[PDB]
Amino acid sequence: TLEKKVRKGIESLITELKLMQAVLSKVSKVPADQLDEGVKIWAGNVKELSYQMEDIVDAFMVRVKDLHRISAALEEVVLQAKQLAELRQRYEQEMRDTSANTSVDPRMMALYTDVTELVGIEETRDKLINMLTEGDDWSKHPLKTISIVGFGGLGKTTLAKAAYDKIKVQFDCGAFVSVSRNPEMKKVLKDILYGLDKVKYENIHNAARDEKYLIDDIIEFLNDKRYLIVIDDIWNEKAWELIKCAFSKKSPGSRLITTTRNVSVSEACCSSEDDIYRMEPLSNDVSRTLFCKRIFSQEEGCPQELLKVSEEILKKCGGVPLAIITIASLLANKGHIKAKDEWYALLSSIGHGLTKNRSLEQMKKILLFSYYDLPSYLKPCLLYLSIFPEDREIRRARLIWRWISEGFVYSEKQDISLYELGDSYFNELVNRSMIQPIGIDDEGKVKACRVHDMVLDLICSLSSEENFVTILDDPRRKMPNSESKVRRLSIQNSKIDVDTTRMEHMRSVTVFSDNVVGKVLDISRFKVLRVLDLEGCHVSDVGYVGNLLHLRYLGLKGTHVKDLPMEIGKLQFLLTLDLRGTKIEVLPWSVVQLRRLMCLYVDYGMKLPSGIGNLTFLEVLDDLGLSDVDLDFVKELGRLTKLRVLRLDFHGFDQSMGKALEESISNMYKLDSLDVFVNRGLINCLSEHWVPPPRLCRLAFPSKRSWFKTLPSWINPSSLPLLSYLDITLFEVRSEDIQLLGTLPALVYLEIWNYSVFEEAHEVEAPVLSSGAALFPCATECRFIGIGAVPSMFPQGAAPRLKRLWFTFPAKWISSENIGLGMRHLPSLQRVVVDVIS
Amino acid sequence: MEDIVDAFMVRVKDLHRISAALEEVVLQAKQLAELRQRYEQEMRDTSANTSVDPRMMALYTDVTELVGIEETRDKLINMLTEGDDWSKHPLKTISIVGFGGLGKTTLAKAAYDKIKVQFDCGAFVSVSRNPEMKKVLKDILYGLDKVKYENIHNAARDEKYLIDDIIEFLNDKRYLIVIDDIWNEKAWELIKCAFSKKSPGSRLITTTRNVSVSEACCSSEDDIYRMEPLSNDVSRTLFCKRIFSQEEGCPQELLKVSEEILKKCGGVPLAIITIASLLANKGHIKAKDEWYALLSSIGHGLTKNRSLEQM
Ligand SMILES: Nc1ncnc2c1ncn2[C@@H]1O[C@H](COP(=O)(O)OP(=O)(O)OP(=O)(O)O)[C@@H](O)[C@H]1O
Ligand SMILES: Nc1ncnc2c1ncn2[C@@H]1O[C@H](COP(=O)(O)OP(=O)(O)OP(=O)(O)O)[C@@H](O)[C@H]1O
Numbered sequence A: 001t002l003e004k005k006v007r008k009g010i011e012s013l014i015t016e017l018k019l020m021q022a023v024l025s026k027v028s029k030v031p032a033d034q035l036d037e038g039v040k041i042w043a044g045n046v047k048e049l050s051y052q053m054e055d056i057v058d059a060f061m062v063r064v065k066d067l068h069r070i071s072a073a074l075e076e077v078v079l080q081a082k083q084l085a086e087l088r089q090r091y092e093q094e095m096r097d098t099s100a101n102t103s104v105d106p107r108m109m110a111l112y113t114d115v116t117e118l119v120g121i122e123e124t125r126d127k128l129i130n131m132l133t134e135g136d137d138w139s140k141h142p143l144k145t146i147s148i149v150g151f152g153g154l155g156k157t158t159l160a161k162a163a164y165d166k167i168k169v170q171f172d173c174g175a176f177v178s179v180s181r182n183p184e185m186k187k188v189l190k191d192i193l194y195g196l197d198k199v200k201y202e203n204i205h206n207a208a209r210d211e212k213y214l215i216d217d218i219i220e221f222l223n224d225k226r227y228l229i230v231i232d233d234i235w236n237e238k239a240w241e242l243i244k245c246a247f248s249k250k251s252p253g254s255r256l257i258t259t260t261r262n263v264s265v266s267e268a269c270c271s272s273e274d275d276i277y278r279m280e281p282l283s284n285d286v287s288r289t290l291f292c293k294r295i296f297s298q299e300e301g302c303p304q305e306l307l308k309v310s311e312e313i314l315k316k317c318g319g320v321p322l323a324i325i326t327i328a329s330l331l332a333n334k335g336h337i338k339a340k341d342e343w344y345a346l347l348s349s350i351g352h353g354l355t356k357n358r359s360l361e362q363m364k365k366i367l368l369f370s371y372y373d374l375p376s377y378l379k380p381c382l383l384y385l386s387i388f389p390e391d392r393e394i395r396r397a398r399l400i401w402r403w404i405s406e407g408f409v410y411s412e413k414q415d416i417s418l419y420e421l422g423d424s425y426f427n428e429l430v431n432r433s434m435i436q437p438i439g440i441d442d443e444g445k446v447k448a449c450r451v452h453d454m455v456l457d458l459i460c461s462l463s464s465e466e467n468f469v470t471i472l473d474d475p476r477r478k479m480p481n482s483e484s485k486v487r488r489l490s491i492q493n494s495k496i497d498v499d500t501t502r503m504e505h506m507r508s509v510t511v512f513s514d515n516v517v518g519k520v521l522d523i524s525r526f527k528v529l530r531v532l533d534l535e536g537c538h539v540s541d542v543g544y545v546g547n548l549l550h551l552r553y554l555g556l557k558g559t560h561v562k563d564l565p566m567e568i569g570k571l572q573f574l575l576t577l578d579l580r581g582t583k584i585e586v587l588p589w590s591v592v593q594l595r596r597l598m599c600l601y602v603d604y605g606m607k608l609p610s611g612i613g614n615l616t617f618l619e620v621l622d623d624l625g626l627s628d629v630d631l632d633f634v635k636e637l638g639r640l641t642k643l644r645v646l647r648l649d650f651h652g653f654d655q656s657m658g659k660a661l662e663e664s665i666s667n668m669y670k671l672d673s674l675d676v677f678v679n680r681g682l683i684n685c686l687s688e689h690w691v692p693p694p695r696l697c698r699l700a701f702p703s704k705r706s707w708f709k710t711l712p713s714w715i716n717p718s719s720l721p722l723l724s725y726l727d728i729t730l731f732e733v734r735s736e737d738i739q740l741l742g743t744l745p746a747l748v749y750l751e752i753w754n755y756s757v758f759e760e761a762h763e764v765e766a767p768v769l770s771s772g773a774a775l776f777p778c779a780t781e782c783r784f785i786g787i788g789a790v791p792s793m794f795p796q797g798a799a800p801r802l803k804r805l806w807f808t809f810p811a812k813w814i815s816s817e818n819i820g821l822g823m824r825h826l827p828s829l830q831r832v833v834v835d836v837i838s
Numbered sequence B: 001m002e003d004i005v006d007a008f009m010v011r012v013k014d015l016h017r018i019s020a021a022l023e024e025v026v027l028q029a030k031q032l033a034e035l036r037q038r039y040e041q042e043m044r045d046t047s048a049n050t051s052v053d054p055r056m057m058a059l060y061t062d063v064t065e066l067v068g069i070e071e072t073r074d075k076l077i078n079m080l081t082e083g084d085d086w087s088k089h090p091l092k093t094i095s096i097v098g099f100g101g102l103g104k105t106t107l108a109k110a111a112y113d114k115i116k117v118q119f120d121c122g123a124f125v126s127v128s129r130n131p132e133m134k135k136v137l138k139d140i141l142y143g144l145d146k147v148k149y150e151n152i153h154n155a156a157r158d159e160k161y162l163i164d165d166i167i168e169f170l171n172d173k174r175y176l177i178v179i180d181d182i183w184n185e186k187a188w189e190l191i192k193c194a195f196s197k198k199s200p201g202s203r204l205i206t207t208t209r210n211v212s213v214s215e216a217c218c219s220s221e222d223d224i225y226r227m228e229p230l231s232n233d234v235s236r237t238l239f240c241k242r243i244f245s246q247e248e249g250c251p252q253e254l255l256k257v258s259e260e261i262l263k264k265c266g267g268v269p270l271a272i273i274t275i276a277s278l279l280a281n282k283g284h285i286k287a288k289d290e291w292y293a294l295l296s297s298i299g300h301g302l303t304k305n306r307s308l309e310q311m
Helices: A001-026 A037-063 A066-089 A126-131 A157-166 A185-196 A213-221 A238-246 A284-293 A307-317 A325-330 A342-349 A361-373 A379-386 A397-407 A419-431 A455-463 A566-570 A631-636 A655-666 A734-741 A755-757 B001-009 B014-038 B073-083 B105-114 B133-144 B161-169 B187-192 B232-242 B254-264 B269-279 B290-297
Strands: A145-149 A176-178 A229-232 A257-258 A436-442 A446-450 A488-491 A508-511 A531-533 A552-554 A599-601 A621-625 A645-652 A675-679 A727-728 A749-756 A781-785 A804-806 A808-810 A835-837 B091-098 B123-126 B179-182 B205-209
Touching: A001 A325, A001 A675, A001 B014, A066 A455, A157 A229, A157 A257, A176 A185, A176 B133, A185 A238, A185 A781, A213 A238, A229 A397, A229 A552, A284 A307, A307 A325, A307 A342, A307 B105, A325 A342, A361 A455, A361 B254, A379 A397, A397 A446, A397 A531, A397 A552, A419 A531, A455 A531, A531 A566, A631 A655, A675 A749, A675 B014, A734 A749, A749 A755, A749 A808, A781 B105, B073 B091, B073 B105, B073 B254, B105 B205, B123 B133, B232 B254, B232 B269, B254 B269, B254 B290
Parallel strands: A145 A257, A176 A229, A229 A257, A488 A508, A508 A531, A531 A552, A599 A621, A621 A645, A645 A675, A727 A749, A749 A781, A781 A804, A808 A835, B091 B205, B123 B179, B179 B205
Antiparallel strands: A436 A446
């Protein structure tokens, strides 16, 4: 009865949501300069109302006393929505004569800069010249493209023009043409035509034929000539392919150049990674020379007392020849306004408030271009990076789980994992040249990520004018004038003002390497809380979570947690549960009560209670402790047919129980990686008659004291052709095992251990790659332990891609003729050191 | 509301139920009324460029790529050029009906490119769904001479005088114009009047997705040119040309998968092109699993993918 009215209101409210995110998505597209401030104010207010409505709908969804509270809340929210409706319309005008001219390109006059000003541009212009002009000799080679990817303002058009200006007189045609974010193909092609001949195509911008006949004209004009066109700032490759068809004829002796901030559109060009040209930030010495060229007259050591400041600030820019230019022009009005005071003020300002200045905003547009080109459902992802401290590394897994728990990832295809979608979001952020990736974790993917400094404080401000995040920093020491409308908090080094009086609807909270937690801060007062992050703290009192219902993320890495409450079953809604580095060594029985989980980063020291097979939705499980286990519990593991990544170590079940689990693995079909740990024994788990899951990529083996008898039969190029990682160890070795392994398609990573060589009195033999010719199309990393891998397995046309190789070499083969090296192989196979054995 | 009105119509106790239903429906109508206005804007500077035609660059494809196009181009040639000898026969049209992307402009261009040097004029002109006759006729004029009619798209005389100009320019010559993608024949009848004079030795070609506008041309079923899906063997050759390097017997275990997929496309040289391009990112991304997934997705969810919506 009453609940029917509530739900019928709720559905209408949700429709109102779709409408309001529609409007907000519409408004946020345009830059915040052409928008009149009335729209700004109205948009801010509707966003604030959007938070409240999302809050109400989430509360109703998690709950179903409460009905009356929900009723009052929804009613009043409708009231102020209705009120805000006409406050807008009450004050508008049209102002037909408001046609203000469109703003010019901020990075246009930057093209008009002095040649004798840039430093260090050399030894890169020459490299890019001879990486494409080496084929200019015998100017009959087929045409090719060389894109240039980068980020921010590291300098792409500058080098493109430099190469364009030098090797130019040896061509019949050419054109330097720019493209904006949302171009008109007719404008672009008119631009190209006017760039070729200005006589016959003088007023080519006037005539408006169509997208076709002008393309036909340009195609006709490009016969029996070498053009060397360059096009820069191409976004959303769908545009480029239209230009691509304009170059569809065979033309020996011509090449073209492209630039963009997305590699993900660059692989669509040149069909080869040998033609992609990454550009790097400048070195420290060149950066210092450039910095001192501007401010100082001729000599830099004259102050001898602001040095520490100088190479402390210059580190923040890193290498981008835009930040250094900006700071050098800003900091010297006329020869050192002053010394060591405003420099330190500037250093403190960056991170929280440096951007708001004069003659500085002319370049922040060049950085917000990339943020504006993002589609929706990705602006929140980029803005989420402001929580973490300035100079720290962010593991991508933490980012993905935080995003999913927040609610920024969702779809309605039902063919997606809800986790590979987060991986897709992360990779889209990466290939847009907005995040630097580092390392490779135990998942076969990127380990962690880092953010550029000026991008960091820029997005910090850009999220700061809204209530998207909130930072408590000593250099900043600022609080918004309204404690009520705070949603996200990123506590940092500051440990003084930890007030929590007026933050009821606190979406999230995190603490970074602080002892202030708990003694000054209370979390239990937060009636709602979406995600909780407390890794690195030194508190073990987390037993108040039973009062929390909306929690999704629960990170407790390195927390000194002795125990966690038995009342955790109330958290029916949950996403992740990380407990690595906790003192608790047994989990409570109230985990069977939980229903929705996909990851469990647990350590094998802890005890897993029986009845684990119920967690069907679980997708990745790490470091499972398999000791003193009954058969039914082991067989439960085959029930949940959704797991993606599993890590196993054990010491106490080496029996036929291994075979019982061994086929129970094959019940799975969603694996990505697997690994097994066991000490000093023959592997009495895997049989030679067991079908593996079709999708397998990593299959590592951490232990080196255990061994297999021989190469398993079920490893074959037939099944599991998706491997990119091998990591095997076994007792014996065969010259035919390598021949078998050379048939698998990818096998990017190779690592093999010969137990008998390093544990028994055996001589390193020389296995022979008998059959085939290459057997290794792409195996960059290959490791052989106790096994002789001479360079002469085959001529250089066997492993095109192999950066590194490791093997053992007897000293008795020095006088032999089986070590016949001396030639250079196809990959960078010149940096090798071998463990020689006497 | 259709439900409510049908219920009332079939029926005439019930009166009160009908009353409540209509009243509440009026209530949701009223509520939804102002939800539209409450969140809406104008954004005068929203002038995004018009979307381009997806099938334009398809016209710009390599000649040495299409297979099996022969023995149909020659057939259409000699079913129109058989009267080209004794080039005094009265002018005639040969329309080309089809559906989907079985390939009509491709064959039209192939015939256009081969038997062309034996004519004084000619023009390949497209028409959209909602054309402007002035635009079409300017297109025709520019395709005849680009010197005297270089900036012919600029001047805006009227639908009359440019028609008179094109009629005048077509004296004592054989033109062989081809016009493709004509829909809603009412557009076509306005153009045929531009070809109203006796011209021995000239013809023209038309294409469309409607036969029902094609009988309006050529006044005879002998001049209608049906075009049909390709044969199984030619389709197999085309399918293996793209994905495979040069030969097909290397897998010897996905063969039956190849035949059971290629049957779904049937014969249309667009579905096979699309699947071949989508299916091999770089040399057989996989083996034997997501082809089964793809086959299963036919019927319910295959269309939602990447680089597929372009067709
Ligand atoms: N060696 C250098 N010395 C001095 N200034 C440099 C140097 N290299 C680049 N710059 C500066 O960097 C900017 C050039 O930017 P860039 O070439 O990357 O432009 P783009 O390709 O249009 O796009 P974006 O800047 O967004 O990457 C200019 O401000 C230029 O003065
Ligand atoms: N023998 C062939 N080999 C390869 N591709 C072909 C072949 N025949 C046709 N195609 C493809 O079919 C498409 C041609 O479409 P078509 O000629 O039917 O266009 P249309 O007349 O403008 O209209 P529609 O496609 O709507 O019927 C192009 O994608 C072309 O590559």
